[PDB]
Amino acid sequence: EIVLTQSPATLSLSPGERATLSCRASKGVSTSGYSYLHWYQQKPGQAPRLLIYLASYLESGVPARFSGSGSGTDFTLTISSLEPEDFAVYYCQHSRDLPLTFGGGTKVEIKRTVAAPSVFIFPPSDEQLKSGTASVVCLLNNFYPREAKVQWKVDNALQSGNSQESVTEQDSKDSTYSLSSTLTLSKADYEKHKVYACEVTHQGLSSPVTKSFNRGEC
Amino acid sequence: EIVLTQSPATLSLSPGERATLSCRASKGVSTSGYSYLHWYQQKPGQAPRLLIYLASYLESGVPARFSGSGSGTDFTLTISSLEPEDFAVYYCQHSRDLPLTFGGGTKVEIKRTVAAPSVFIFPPSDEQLKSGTASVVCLLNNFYPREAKVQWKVDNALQSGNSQESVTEQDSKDSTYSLSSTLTLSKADYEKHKVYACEVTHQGLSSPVTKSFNRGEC
Amino acid sequence: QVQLVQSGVEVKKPGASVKVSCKASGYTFTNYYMYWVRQAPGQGLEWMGGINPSNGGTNFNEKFKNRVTLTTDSSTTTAYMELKSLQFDDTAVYYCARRDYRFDMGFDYWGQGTTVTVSSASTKGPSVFPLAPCSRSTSESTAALGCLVKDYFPEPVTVSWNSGALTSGVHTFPAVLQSSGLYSLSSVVTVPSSSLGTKTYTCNVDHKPSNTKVDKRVESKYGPPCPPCEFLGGPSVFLFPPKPKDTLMISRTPEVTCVVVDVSQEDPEVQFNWYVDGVEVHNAKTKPREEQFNSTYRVVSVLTVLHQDWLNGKEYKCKVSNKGLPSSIEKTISKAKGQPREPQVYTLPPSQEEMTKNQVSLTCLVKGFYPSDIAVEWESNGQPENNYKTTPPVLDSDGSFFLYSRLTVDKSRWQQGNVFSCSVMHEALHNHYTQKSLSLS
Amino acid sequence: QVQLVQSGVEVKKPGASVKVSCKASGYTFTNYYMYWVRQAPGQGLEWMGGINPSNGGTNFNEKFKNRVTLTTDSSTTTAYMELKSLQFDDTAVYYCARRDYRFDMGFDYWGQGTTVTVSSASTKGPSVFPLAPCSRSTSESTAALGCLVKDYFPEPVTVSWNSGALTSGVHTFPAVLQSSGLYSLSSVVTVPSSSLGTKTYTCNVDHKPSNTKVDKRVESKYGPPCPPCGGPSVFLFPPKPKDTLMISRTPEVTCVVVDVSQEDPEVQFNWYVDGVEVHNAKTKPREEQFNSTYRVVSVLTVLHQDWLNGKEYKCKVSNKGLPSSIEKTISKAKGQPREPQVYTLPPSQEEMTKNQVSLTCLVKGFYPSDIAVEWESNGQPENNYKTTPPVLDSDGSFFLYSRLTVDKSRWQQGNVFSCSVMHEALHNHYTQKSLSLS
Ligand SMILES: *[C@@H]1O[C@H](CO[C@@H]2O[C@@H](C)[C@@H](O)[C@@H](O)[C@@H]2O)[C@@H](O[C@@H]2O[C@H](CO)[C@@H](O[C@@H]3O[C@H](CO[C@H]4O[C@H](CO)[C@@H](O)[C@H](O)[C@@H]4O[C@@H]4O[C@H](CO)[C@@H](O)[C@H](O)[C@H]4NC(C)=O)[C@@H](O)[C@H](O[C@H]4O[C@H](CO)[C@@H](O)[C@H](O)[C@@H]4O)[C@@H]3O)[C@H](O)[C@H]2NC(C)=O)[C@H](O)[C@H]1NC(C)=O
Ligand SMILES: OC[C@H]1O[C@@](CO)(O[C@H]2O[C@H](CO)[C@@H](O)[C@H](O)[C@H]2O)[C@@H](O)[C@@H]1O
Ligand SMILES: OC[C@H]1O[C@@](CO)(O[C@H]2O[C@H](CO)[C@@H](O)[C@H](O)[C@H]2O)[C@@H](O)[C@@H]1O
Ligand SMILES: OC[C@H]1O[C@@](CO)(O[C@H]2O[C@H](CO)[C@@H](O)[C@H](O)[C@H]2O)[C@@H](O)[C@@H]1O
Structure with a gap:
């Protein structure tokens, strides 16, 4: 062997x-x-x-x-x-x-050349919330290199083992990477908290970029 | 008998x-x-x-x-x-x-006691404009006494013969009336004119109330 | 649990027949006569006939004898009214009603009524069009929305909102009859402006003669696929008059209070603008913003009342601008019935230095008045004058207004002792009129 | 040409079996071994086994001996790989690859691969949910929108935008296998934020194993039934009358632009004095004015004589939120100057019963209406006075009144009061008239 x-x-x-x-x-x-x-x-x-x-x-x-x-x-x-x-x-x-x-x-x-990620956050849709589950999606767009850390925070509390990430292949035209992070919660657990945010760390960022939203305010 | x-x-x-x-x-x-x-x-x-x-x-x-x-x-x-x-x-x-x-x-x-109407104007729906007619509606809500006058103006031209009104029966709790007036035009005539106004005269109103909209700003 | 349930809407051709059923429940069917009464459009009540379910004995109104048949079905405890050789004037609402067999104690229970239309015109289902405002404005606290149910025949149509869940503020209007012979009806609902985009609004229209059942969406949520345009609907402003409750004494110092809620954490910075009769004022006390507590912010601005402004009926306007939003939220309050201030009128002769000229000025000082709405005129020996001018009202230090009116006259006319009068018209005067005279001493 | 064509997609339950075929063509089938290699998703290559077609001799990897059966058909030049007792971690792409029997020169030709999924699910179509910003008002020019394609089985799903029309800015992510054993992926697209309510955005999701097609509208155009929720304007302010009439004071023309967009915060000012461009204006930096708008101010100083001899002060403002450019002009009111006459009037006899009395100054016969009126007592300025606006008289000139409020005692104790007027038609732009108890 x-x-x-x-x-x-x-x-x-x-x-x-x-x-x-x-x-x-x-x-x-x-x-x-x-x-x-x-x-x-x-x-x-x-x-x-x-x-x-x-x-x-x-x-x-x-x-x-x-x-x-x-x-x-x-x-x-x-x-x-x-x-x-x-x-x-x-x-x-x-x-x-x-x-x-x-x-x-x-x-x-x-x-x-190092490109910072254009970060966006999406709340769960009303249509999904009627099904009992809630997916909060954070998008890190057109960045380089592939290494980037995504931390999910709910009411400033760190989340662990309730997320999943997916990354694209290097883009043919501009040689950039894009990443998606989904935080999945139940409707009951999602209704218990109010503030949702994804903090992003990357070589192109001088300080962590944190895009957020408030459950009721949408 | x-x-x-x-x-x-x-x-x-x-x-x-x-x-x-x-x-x-x-x-x-x-x-x-x-x-x-x-x-x-x-x-x-x-x-x-x-x-x-x-x-x-x-x-x-x-x-x-x-x-x-x-x-x-x-x-x-x-x-x-x-x-x-x-x-x-x-x-x-x-x-x-x-x-x-x-x-x-x-x-x-x-x-x-005297109650002035609250007035609301409604433009025709795009759905109705697919047919060849335009209905413009004016609502006079919760007023007393019954006597009320509506005047329709299309680009400051007083309308006659192309309006119809309905008055509700006296309300069983508050004793008010409500009135809906509809101005009916051909779509062709509707699209040739800009400001649609509903003018209301009632005992509760010292001076008449006019509600308007400009076609195309909806 | 006495119930009489009638069959549904009918439309028939002249010369044809209609059979109206009345299903009885909650009582001994055979102990009551069943009567039939109609109500034609623009009419009162008309007795048609009656039947005895125990033995089938009948009585009829002679006007319908020969066209009406009354029948019973004991197993289904149902009574039927059949009207044959229909006429255009048989269009009416038809009712069944019961009457105690042994004692005549009136028609104590009635069916809900059956609308019957007699016509050779064709049945047509309605088109349902939403009624929504052409870009709603601020600071309108109430919004209206509705449905236009157009071009149907025959009557009736039923309308409900959010499947019967929304009933408050609903007005379903009687139908209108168009020159085409088709009907139209409008249903509306008034809701708080704050609710638009929070809840969906749908009218449910039913036209049973054509089997039309439409659920028309009038207003959606905020709310993909609707473009986003800040969130939460918008901050809410509440403007309070001077009070509050509990106790005395000189602290106290009556104040108008502006309070704003539903101010987000991402857009916390708020600005307050205060107007007294549309004149911006700067003495307000803007309290430091507070998080407490749900999730939003609460910012309070207190404006002290001055002079006798609240009692005079002055308008206090509070405008709130949130740093990050496109518009400004304006709220206005005032005392319902204000106490006006009476004008004081004074006449002043020409300056000694102006007496060297060919024309001299007679002056009228009018002061201490509220509201600003006033008129001044002049007369000479009682006759209305021709060439005078009055300044606009000027806001004084004590919250009242003053102005001047000037009459130009030939010096010869002043010198020959003619009596000139300054006349004032205002809400706070006895008979809304007063005059002050001026003559060469 | 050498070709190895494999059989199609396989979806099995654990404990089941699978048989993959590999059709060989374009070569002498019996002169090459046929090997089997697999690749689990996002992992490396694992050699499973090999078969010698000429004699049926098999070689294996210890992990796959007992569960794999390798077979061959020399008539149909087809190799088969039967994997029994399937487990979730047998999920992979399975490849056949040939190898020279005499001299080993690597796996020179490979088949295209056969995907095998081992799972307890249960073919299921996706729920397609929109991905949109909670509050895309902002000052940023680019917005992201998408579709969350959740809870489907098995792979694959295909995502398009606007039926193939929208391709630039799209990123369809690889699927993720959730704890439930159902897949999920997101597709996103970056678009200009201006387009949001102007253009339609629809994702077309196709899941062929369940025969499901979904065209989910994520963003529509503006208009009902959607709930309801105008470019820069310019104001030009003249100098203050006292500043044009007094040589000590400095007169300025102020140009302010409001309703400036956040995405377009330009500060382009051009000034002209009597049609001729000037460059001595002191422009100020822009500021956010508690609206979703910017405000910026430019101040041009003017000489006293230039404003008094007329002179048009034009302010041209430029910004990329305008179809053209806004231009406002200002100057002193035109027309023949006329000189004010100033008269003082004592309190009315009837007003003497009050604690405070009114001192009146009539200013008449002046043109233009730009004037400044003040009061002085003995040898110092006063405060409790209000002046009316100028009123146009029937002779084409203006008059006004100024009123000084005083304590009756001050008037009664003989204090001298002065009404001072500054106007362009007066000598030295100034006059004063006194008032005293007679
Ligand atoms: C978003 O916010 C902008 C900024 O406003 C501030 O912030 C908001 C959030 C609120 O808190 C406001 O209360 C606050 O003011 C808005 O800007 C305003 O836009 C409007 C246009 O709609 C402008 O209106 C015009 O005003 C002229 C007079 O302006 C003078 O007087 C005002 C007080 O009465 C004062 O606020 C102004 O600053 C200005 O003051 C003079 O400034 C110069 C230069 O510094 C000085 O030399 C003078 O001494 C000052 N004079 C005084 C008396 O203080 C009007 O003349 C003008 O009217 C003319 O044109 C209109 C048509 O356009 C005609 O109908 C009219 O008959 C007439 O011919 C007009 O009313 C306003 O000035 C702007 N405010 C400022 C601070 O510049 C944005 O509008 C707002 N956006 C939206 C969409 O809401
Ligand atoms: O001054 C001439 C003439 O103007 C009018 C216009 O009707 O208005 C002036 O006088 C009023 C009081 O009489 C003021 O309220 C107003 O502001 C002022 O412009 C006439 O009333 C007056 O005779
Ligand atoms: O597909 C099997 C493969 O996926 C893993 C790792 O992502 O997890 C999934 O496996 C099963 C799929 O049906 C589920 O039991 C499990 O919950 C799911 O996460 C591994 O288990 C395995 O290598
Ligand atoms: O009219 C001649 C001349 O007299 C003045 C005063 O000096 O104006 C007076 O006469 C006018 C005509 O009746 C009035 O309109 C004016 O109010 C009055 O003072 C001059 O201004 C005028 O040129």
Whole structure:
């Protein structure tokens, strides 16, 4: 049972830069003159695509800019010069022994100037409130990098384990991220409190931005 | 047939006053110790209600302030201490003979202090404008006495022949009236003019009240 | 629990028939006669006939004998009135009513009535149009809304609001008959302005002859899909007169109080503007804003009354502007019946220095009056004059007004001892009239 | 061309079974292994097993031995993967991928994937709720609106805006699997806040597994049945009469603009003296005046002679909330000046019975109406006086009265009182007339 560690988990570069992805095997994968390690590219919603096989030989149909190097336990996949089509996840795989295992992946993301999030808050709709549940939605729009902390507060009291976040993929045109946070409460628990707010922390913000509303005042 | 002559036709009194309604039969309606003459109260939108039977017996459930008297040909209904809810038409009826016949009624109206109308104007709905007619409505709410005048002006031109009014019956609690006037125009004529005005004249208003709107500012 | 329930609205053609049922309950059906009475439009009550349910014996009004049939059904305790060979003038409300068999004690219980229309005109259901204000204004505390139920035949139509839940302030008007022969009716409701956008308002219209049942929405909530346009409906202003309650003495100092509530936490800053007869005043005591307690803010402004202003009937106007909202909320109060102040009238001869001119000025000082509404005229030996001018009223330090009126005359006329009079018309004068004379001494 | 086509979407209950197919084409099926790899949502790749089509020889991952059956059909060049005893964490996209039998050169061709959902739910269509600002009045130019597509099963849902017409600014988030086992997603769109009641905003949600289509109106145009809830204006103020008549004092023309929008707070002022542009106006910074509006003031100083010889002072105001520009003009009242005559009048004989008496000053025959009137006692200014506005007489000139209220004792003890008038037609713009008990 051989395991593969990839590094860095996330690589943030500009189109034109070089990408050097690393893969480390717990035991040696080279046997009889060949290193049984391969690389794959994965775009969202698509199957993985073979790039390099046996850690070096280029796969038919794959661009010249992709190359692989390594033997033993340390392997490198290089992308001499990135293109917009190269921003994707990259996986390493061994086959010197069964079971076959993959590395955890390395996401190659587009580098960009820091943009603060345009934050918006939405109360639960009247239509929903008649159903017994209440969803309060906080939107963090067109920001970069992906790291951003959303804290939900009800009457200045911190909330925990009653929220769920979802994030978009990096936008094709402006290379930005958008995030949604939903605080779910029952109608009884929602009717008990009055003030609802989502505080947002991000590299682009000099001080936490907090958008809020009052239950009755709508 | 027996003709039952009621008088007065109308009676306008303040609450707390005694009301005296008379019924004179053309032939005697008394026989063997009984006078076959009954009194009813009819309020707007309801069936007549029996008050008094056989000239002077009070019907169960009717308040004691109602009483009947007389014999032979001359009969009287008395309301000793009028209330606002006593607004109604009161009829006498005999059963001495066939055909059974009713008097022509006495209408009891309640007097109160002068109340100026509150005026409201309503433009035609976009829904009605899909057809080829425009109805403009004016409301004169909760006023006393009944006499009120509405004048319609379309870009300062006095309207005639294209208006209709309805007046409510006197209210059973506050003793006021309300009036709705409708100006009816073709959509073509409605769209050729800008300001629609309803002018109200009433005793409670020292100077007339005008409510207006400009078509297109709705 | 005596009940007589009649069948529903009917519309029939002339020459046809109508059968009205009357279902009796809560009593021994066979111990009461059933009578039929109608009420034609613009008419009184008319007896049609009666039946004895125990044996089927009948009596009829000779006017309908030959066209009316009375029948009973003992198993369903129902009485029927059938009127055949219908005439246009048979249009009426028809009632059943009971009468005790053994003793004639009147028609003690009646059915609710059946509206019957006789017509060869076609049945038509109404169009229901909402009545909503053309952009409602401030500071109107009451709003009206309604429904126009247009172009239907025959009568009647029923209207309710919010499925019968809304009854207070409702006026359903009698129908109007258009020149087309079709009816229209309007139903309205008055509600607090504060309630618009809080609750929905819908009129429920039923026209049973055409099986029309419409629920027309007149006013919605604030309230996606309605664009947002601040929230809560808006802050509410309450302007109180001088009182309050409890005790004496010289503290005291009567005050008009302006109180505002439903002021949000995101828009707390409030400004107060005070007007006495539409003249801005600046002596008011605006108390510091307080959170207490629900969630909103409460800000209080106290204006001290001056002179005899409240008793004179002066108007105290408080205007509240919230920092963040588009408009200003204005409230006005005053004593119902004000005590006016009487004008004092004084005549002044021409200045000694003006006596060197060809024309001299006769002056009339009028002061100490309230209201400002006044008129001044002049006369010469009692005859109304031609060339005089009066200034507008000027507000004095004591809360009353003063003015001057000036009459120009030839010096020769003043010098020959003619009597000139200054005449004043005002609410606070005996016979709304007074004059003061001036002559060369 | 080499192609691996997999069978469609699968939705199973836990404890059930699933069989996925992988149709191979464009190559010699028996010269390649067929491998099975899965990917759980937002996770990495897990190799399950492999089959050698030429002999049926299978290799597995310990975690999948016993639950997976791998089969092949060489006539139909199809590989199958049967996963038995399904568990919630078998929810993934399952892929087939081939591999050369002789020399291992990686998984060079993959199928498109087959999504398998393992759940106790129960196909269900979404409840679509609107997402809108609680109070979008603000001063910000961009508003966000959306649709919350909650409680549906299984995936996927599709969201469009205005039937495909609205594409810019849209962000449809990936679905979230809630504790209930029902999915939920939000779709949002940023639009210009000006458009809110001018344009319609509708999200079109389609959930094909339940055959549900919902076109939810989140924001409509203005008008009934919606409950009900005009650009900048300019005022130009002339100098004070005393300031134009006294050389010590400074006269100014003040231009104020009100009803300025929060989104458009421009401060563009242009001043003209007799049609010729000037630049010596001292403009002040803008301020929020407890309304949803801004107010800003510009003050142009004027020379005494320029105002007195007429001269038109024009104030042009510019702002991006106007179709064009607002321009107001002011000047001294036109017409031939006429000189005031000043007369003092003692109290009426009848007013002498009162504690306080009136001293009257008549000022007549003046043009224009700009004038200042004051009172003095002995050798100092007075306070308890009120002056009437100027009144136009029948001869085209103005008159007024000024009234000084005094304690009868002050008048009776012989104090001298003075009525002083400042007007342009007077010599040195000033005159004074005295009043004393005779
Ligand atoms: C939102 O708020 C704005 C700011 O107002 C302040 O804040 C609000 C919230 C309230 O608290 C207010 O009480 C408060 O004032 C509003 O601005 C006002 O807009 C209106 C337009 O609708 C302006 O009205 C015009 O006023 C002229 C006279 O103005 C002088 O006198 C006023 C008192 O009587 C005084 O308040 C003014 O400041 C101004 O004072 C002079 O200022 C100059 C320069 O500093 C000095 O040199 C003088 O000495 C001052 N003189 C005095 C006596 O103090 C009118 O002449 C004018 O009328 C003319 O035009 C109209 C048509 O436009 C004709 O109908 C009319 O017949 C005539 O020809 C007009 O009434 C008002 O001045 C504005 N107030 C200020 C402070 O500038 C916004 O309107 C408001 N927005 C909405 C939508 O509500
Ligand atoms: O001054 C001439 C002439 O003007 C009128 C207009 O009707 O109004 C003036 O006088 C009134 C009192 O008589 C004042 O109330 C008013 O403000 C003033 O302009 C006439 O009344 C007067 O004869
Ligand atoms: O789909 C299974 C997968 O989802 C997880 C993590 O999000 O949670 C869900 O799993 C079940 C779905 O029917 C529910 O029992 C559970 O409440 C829900 O949150 C994991 O349990 C699992 O890996
Ligand atoms: O009319 C000549 C001349 O006299 C004055 C006073 O000096 O005006 C007086 O006569 C006018 C005509 O009757 C009046 O209108 C005016 O009120 C009165 O003082 C001058 O002003 C005028 O030019």
